[PDB]
Amino acid sequence: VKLAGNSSLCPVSGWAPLSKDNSVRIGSKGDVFVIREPFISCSPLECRTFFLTQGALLNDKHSDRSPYRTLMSVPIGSVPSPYNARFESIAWSASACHDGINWLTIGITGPDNGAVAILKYNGIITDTIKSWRNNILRTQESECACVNGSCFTVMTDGPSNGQASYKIFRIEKGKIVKSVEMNAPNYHYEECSCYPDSSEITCVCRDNWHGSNRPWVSFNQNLEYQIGYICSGIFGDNPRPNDKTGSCGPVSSNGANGVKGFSFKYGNGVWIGRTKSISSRNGFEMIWDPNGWTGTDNNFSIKQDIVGINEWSGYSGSFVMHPELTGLDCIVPCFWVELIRGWTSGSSISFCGVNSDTVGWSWPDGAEL
Amino acid sequence: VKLAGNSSLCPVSGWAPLSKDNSVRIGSKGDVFVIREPFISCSPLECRTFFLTQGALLNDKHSDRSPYRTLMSVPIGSVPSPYNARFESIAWSASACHDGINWLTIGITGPDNGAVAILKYNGIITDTIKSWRNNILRTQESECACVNGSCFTVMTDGPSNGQASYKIFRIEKGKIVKSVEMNAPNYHYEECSCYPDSSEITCVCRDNWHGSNRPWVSFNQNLEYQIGYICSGIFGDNPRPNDKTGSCGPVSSNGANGVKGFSFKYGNGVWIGRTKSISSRNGFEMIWDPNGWTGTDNNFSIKQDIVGINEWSGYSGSFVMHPELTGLDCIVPCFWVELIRGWTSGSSISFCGVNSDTVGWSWPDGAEL
Amino acid sequence: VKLAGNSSLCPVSGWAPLSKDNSVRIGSKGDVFVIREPFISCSPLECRTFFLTQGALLNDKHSDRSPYRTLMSVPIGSVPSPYNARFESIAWSASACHDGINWLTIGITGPDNGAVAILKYNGIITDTIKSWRNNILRTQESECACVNGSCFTVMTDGPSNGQASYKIFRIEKGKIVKSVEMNAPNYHYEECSCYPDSSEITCVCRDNWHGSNRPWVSFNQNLEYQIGYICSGIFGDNPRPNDKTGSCGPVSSNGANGVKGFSFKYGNGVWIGRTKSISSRNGFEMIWDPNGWTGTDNNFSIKQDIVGINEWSGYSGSFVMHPELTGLDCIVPCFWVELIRGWTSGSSISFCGVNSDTVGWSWPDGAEL
Amino acid sequence: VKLAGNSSLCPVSGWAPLSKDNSVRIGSKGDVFVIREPFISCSPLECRTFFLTQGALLNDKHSDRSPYRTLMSVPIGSVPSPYNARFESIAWSASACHDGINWLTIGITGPDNGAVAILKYNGIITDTIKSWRNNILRTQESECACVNGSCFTVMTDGPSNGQASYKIFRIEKGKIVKSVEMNAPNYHYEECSCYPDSSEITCVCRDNWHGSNRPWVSFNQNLEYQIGYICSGIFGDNPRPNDKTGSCGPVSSNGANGVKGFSFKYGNGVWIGRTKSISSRNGFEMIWDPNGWTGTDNNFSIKQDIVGINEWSGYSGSFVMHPELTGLDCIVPCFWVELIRGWTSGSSISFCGVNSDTVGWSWPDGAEL
Ligand SMILES: C#CCCC(=O)N[C@@H]1C(C(=O)O)=C[C@H](N)[C@@H](NC(C)=O)[C@@H]1OC(CC)CC
Ligand SMILES: C#CCCC(=O)N[C@@H]1C(C(=O)O)=C[C@H](N)[C@@H](NC(C)=O)[C@@H]1OC(CC)CC
Ligand SMILES: C#CCCC(=O)N[C@@H]1C(C(=O)O)=C[C@H](N)[C@@H](NC(C)=O)[C@@H]1OC(CC)CC
Ligand SMILES: C#CCCC(=O)N[C@@H]1C(C(=O)O)=C[C@H](N)[C@@H](NC(C)=O)[C@@H]1OC(CC)CC
Ligand SMILES: *[C@@H]1O[C@H](CO)[C@@H](O)[C@H](O)[C@H]1NC(C)=O
Ligand SMILES: *[C@@H]1O[C@H](CO)[C@@H](O)[C@H](O)[C@H]1NC(C)=O
Ligand SMILES: *[C@@H]1O[C@H](CO)[C@@H](O)[C@H](O)[C@H]1NC(C)=O
Ligand SMILES: *[C@@H]1O[C@H](CO)[C@@H](O)[C@H](O)[C@H]1NC(C)=O
Ligand SMILES: [Ca+2]
Ligand SMILES: [Ca+2]
Ligand SMILES: [Ca+2]
Ligand SMILES: [Ca+2]
């Protein structure tokens, strides 16, 4: 049966460690893929870690948008290895989600001025999307969000240092049944972290142009959308300035560049995941701001340490566990963090929201380079 | 349930990348088989990559018709490794197909003057075919075509540089229920790429004797056959002469030798896969000729680049995705290309026909030799 | 269906060898995890070997309570390898049991003064337990015991060289439904080996403070408990004094330190597993004492050799095979022994109780260090 | 459902190659077990290759009746590797068979004067047999034969160079329900190759004492047995004298030592598998003698080459494919041959009987030592 996606997010007070692969430590002697942009998506039976690889192993001579880049997956917490990974698609930009029946995989390959998103449902090529601006067509690098047998992704075509073009897609059994181009002047959306919540999708993305707070887009199944930036003074992007009275549009100071991130909206409040360091991808923390989605103060209630400031962090993204898998009545928010090493590889650690006691530790990669 | 095979081929305007194993790059450090003649066949659940190997790994001192040659298979896009490959049969010439119930595997082993085709259904030896000419009995090196619980293959016995003997087989549950010898003087059929289309089989083969255009044979379930050459001036074999006013029989100029290929017939039109270079196995392109199956001009409508002219290509062959697996109403045409390196090994890339937008790129092997 | 857990233990007269992984010998050349604290738990279909690892392989540069420690599992008798192990949880102290429906995993991670037990049911984080004394929260390092859809574990918080705090937990579908703190002054419980027997749980634990005989706790499903020490003069812990007229409380002579062990209670009698050497973790033997659970003599009836005195032994723990898996009418007692080498890695051998003929041999690790 | 075992053997005229693992060639670079005594048994779904290993890989410093010897299995034709092998039992002498429901595995371990056969049904220890003569208790080293939910094996206790003691066992769900000691003075039975045929079992064994022809024992489900030697002048054992007028009891000339073999009885006729060389384990051939089971001439009708005389052979043993797996009306005879290399390892090739055309080739190991 297909995921309903109509329950609310469970309210959470902390984040409990779900998984850790230790891929680089094992790949020092074992045959482990050099991986980039890992993300986790869950089926109603189990959760999988998806990753992009060029077919180069750790400690090998063969180790962004190459023709050899493929999307592969393993069960969560297992090493990305040639002997246990499942091929998904050829992709240097990818997304994947399970609608309750089969796996949808969106894989983008091709040249920078001619890229095509290849949509695969149950391993079968079902649809393709041409680049509409011929400037690096790219997608979430995280899981897509499925509601009621239909899965949703956000894709960007255009410059990563200026105004680009952002599209929302409705996909059913791998086929695009509705496409909507967002009208968002002075916005910038890269690598969206989309999750379902009460039959609607909320994506928290990255402003690579002029924003150090994170843009967001929320839409329903017929793709009527709303846009804005997370108005909290606790800025989510990296690089970013010091915490101050934030803006409700894009914060221009240290607004260029960025990192893929996420945020979970709880009414007027937001759970914010961000790096600890304001300049480099170092550290990770979860911050609960009960008025941060709309209010502009830099006041926060809960801070939980995820990765220590001396250890390397990187991409972060959301994923959810539906009631069809958990047995619960609500959608469990979860996230992963990529711990980049460097070749250039990186393992991943994942956390799921709980309403019980947790502890703020550091769970770093721990490989000797 | 068994595959019906009564639907037509879906009309396609482009080819979308399905899979890429990157076997040599991974086998630089990993334990990956040295493989030759890889081909892809699909069950109603999933597609598998079949390959021949001698039990020698890449970067190993143990690396054509040896007693050690075996047919093995992996899930599509996974590396051919001893730790994940499934044994199929002992074979230095092979074919495999799924009828909807079980896997049929046809494996040819034995001496050159005494070879025997071993037919295995669900891993059980069900029938054997002796060599009837005692001169290297050989078969498709690609998937066989199944229609209505019955699978069909073409086999050759005789010289590869002259007139040989060609047979068509009807196989049900691994048992040969009808055999027909083709009466084709001045023809030559090697390594046929057979596909089902509207309860009939069409095979596009290789003339190793005196033809630079490809011979074809089409037959029904009772093995009444028709023969000819693809009459287009866009010649399919490699080596081949320059494009000119082609012949409807064999083209003698540069007609000797060749490469395993394929073609998809669409009424009077044909999709032609061929190497880009006319002398060496370099490059690959898909050419749509709307009158190429019977007309003799060198005019073509669509050309899509598959492999660039500077990268090594090799064997190509067809495979299909039935409606029992895709959920569609038509049979999806698909093909694979072997990218030979060199030891002598070769990874494979695969494409499936789509009626949506695609891009002509190059997806080469990419291993440093 | 869920395990009933209401049948008695089968009476056994000997122990038959169930499994042997030979992990260090294979990890001399293969890619095998460096593992510590291995234990075996059984589902109604198969038995699995659980283990803790840091992601370091044998013969590798990367080889107690680190952030990188994870709980992983393999099928019983298979090597702990990155290519075949299943991730369970992040843990430097762990327990796992199958209730007949899904796997429960209890994983303890975090700092020594802030550790949290993470409970996962079917891979889903269901509950967490904070440390209540902030002094290394720790658990069984063996299987938990499930009776009637509910699984039971014992956890310790406090000093390992003095009086600590001991808690009993009732867990249903990964959720703690009842917790009881034991009132046991002058006792000490570490690394309990709990098994079900006639709708009740019996745990045989380790006194690290002042006991060379083993403490025990027995409780029902509503966690009404009884406590004591195994009163036999055949002392179970290591280190221990010579066999003498033992005490029914803790034996203070050589009572400090210890090793994780087990014992099976049969009315007034006990099957005692212990090291052969009284000072070092060397050797292993199973001793049947028909009055040892309450009587204080050093008289015994059966002694079966498990590991010879010259070979290294280590942690031992119980596990059971339920009638839902064996088809029997009784619960089969079984145990494993960790053969520590040294890096520091330890393979494991396992035995199950039988009422037929057996032999006392030695089944050592056998790796050349 | 359980195998009926009541159909006759299919009459066969030749032997078709079923499988070849190429284990030593792959283990030159890959991580492959050093294996001895491989044998093949089949479930109603698939056939598996069982083997004994010490946990030592090929090209490793850790490479008969050791405590580390274990019985493991892989799917047929796959390499014996730590990453894909399934543990069965601890054993330096083994047998295994599938009754149609679960796998029965008989594993013998322990000291030479105290060995115990450990019987496992579905991975569960169900019964044990003590040594009754305290002189190396040993069993078939091939598959046991199951008829009507009951499986049968032959075991030997006593000297391998003189009169020993031979027992027949009836096993149901892993439990010995009937045992019968054979009264066979001047006979010698080692490593029996037993197969079912028309609700009865026939075992063809090895005379290590004073016989160069093979002894046989045939019995029904209540273990009423008949004994004799294969009376053909085409002698089956190795070493053996030249072909002459053979005896119907044991042939004393070159009767000492031997090799594990098999034979298939077809009324008064026998299919004989034997080495080509009369002194060393070199070559293998299948010989059809239509009067060889009782007649004493050295006349034969069919000889098919299996392994050439210059290549190393070794242990051979029978196995069968039941109608529950093949879909046929008869039991298909099959056999395997161990190609010993040398460490001391050896791959295996397997053949199944067919009533169609085959060819006598050589399928050797092919590893460079
Ligand atoms: C600022 C900065 C650094 C931007 C950069 O070089 N690379 C970005 C990146 C990263 O790790 O940052 C990882 C991805 N591999 C990139 N994606 C693609 C399709 O290549 C992504 O780039 C995107 C998003 C900005 C735009 C093409
Ligand atoms: C011209 C030319 C080169 C022909 C040649 O040497 N080898 C051919 C080949 C290739 O890669 O070309 C690959 C196959 N391994 C060959 N098949 C067999 C049974 O060996 C095949 O040969 C066939 C088809 C011609 C005839 C026996
Ligand atoms: C006496 C003695 C030696 C105690 C010691 O150093 N380590 C103990 C141990 C062992 O192998 O003995 C293995 C475990 N890794 C330890 N567990 C934890 C949570 O670290 C355990 O320690 C426990 C139990 C005493 C208390 C924290
Ligand atoms: C002639 C001769 C002696 C040959 C010898 O040393 N070993 C024999 C053997 C072989 O490869 O021949 C392989 C087996 N590993 C042996 N089996 C056991 C239980 O060890 C078997 O021995 C059996 C059968 C004779 C008697 C114990
Ligand atoms: C959400 O979907 C479930 C499953 O179909 C349904 O029972 C429930 O009523 C829905 N929720 C609401 C608020 O309608
Ligand atoms: C194809 O044949 C099958 C089996 O004969 C039949 O069920 C099906 O209807 C046929 N297909 C079409 C499109 O009619
Ligand atoms: C255990 O409980 C089951 C039902 O859950 C019951 O049928 C069975 O008789 C009980 N066993 C004993 C030994 O009481
Ligand atoms: C074997 O036993 C089965 C039991 O169902 C029976 O149906 C079958 O006829 C028997 N076979 C023969 C050859 O007698
Ligand atoms: Ca930014
Ligand atoms: Ca040609
Ligand atoms: Ca103690
Ligand atoms: Ca002999």
TrEMBL record, chains A, B, C, D:
Regulation of catalytic or functional activity: Inhibited by the neuraminidase inhibitors zanamivir (Relenza) and oseltamivir (Tamiflu). These drugs interfere with the release of progeny virus from infected cells and are effective against all influenza strains. Resistance to neuraminidase inhibitors is quite rare.
Keyword S-adenosyl-L-methionine: no
Single annotated GO MF: metal ion binding
Entry comment on modification after translation: N-glycosylated.
Catalytic activity: Hydrolysis of alpha-(2->3)-, alpha-(2->6)-, alpha-(2->8)- glycosidic linkages of terminal sialic acid residues in oligosaccharides, glycoproteins, glycolipids, colominic acid and synthetic substrates
Enzyme class: hydrolase
Active site: D64 (proton donor/acceptor), Y315 (nucleophile)
Disulfide bonds: C10-C330, C42-C47, C97-C144, C146-C151, C192-C205, C194-C203, C231-C248, C334-C352
Binding sites annotated in the UniProt record for Ca(2+): D207, G211, D237, N257
Keyword annotations of the record: Calcium, Disulfide bond, Glycoprotein, Glycosidase, Host cell membrane, Host membrane, Hydrolase, Membrane, Metal-binding, Signal-anchor, Transmembrane, Transmembrane helix, Virion
Region annotation (Head of neuraminidase) ranges: 9-369
EC number: 3.2.1.18
GO terms (BP aspect): carbohydrate metabolic process; viral budding from plasma membrane
Domain of life: Viruses
Cellular-component GO terms for this entry: host cell plasma membrane; membrane; virion membrane
Membrane topology (UniProt): Single-pass type II membrane protein
Compartments reported by the entry: Host membrane; Virion membrane; Host apical cell membrane
Family, similarity comment: Belongs to the glycosyl hydrolase 34 family.
Record's comment describing the protein's domains: Intact N-terminus is essential for virion morphogenesis. Possess two apical sorting signals, one in the ectodomain, which is likely to be a glycan, and the other in the transmembrane domain. The transmembrane domain also plays a role in lipid raft association.
Quaternary state and interactors: Homotetramer.
Protein known as: Neuraminidase
Species per Swiss-Prot/TrEMBL record: Influenza A virus
Gene: NA
Region of the whole protein represented: 83 to 463 of 469
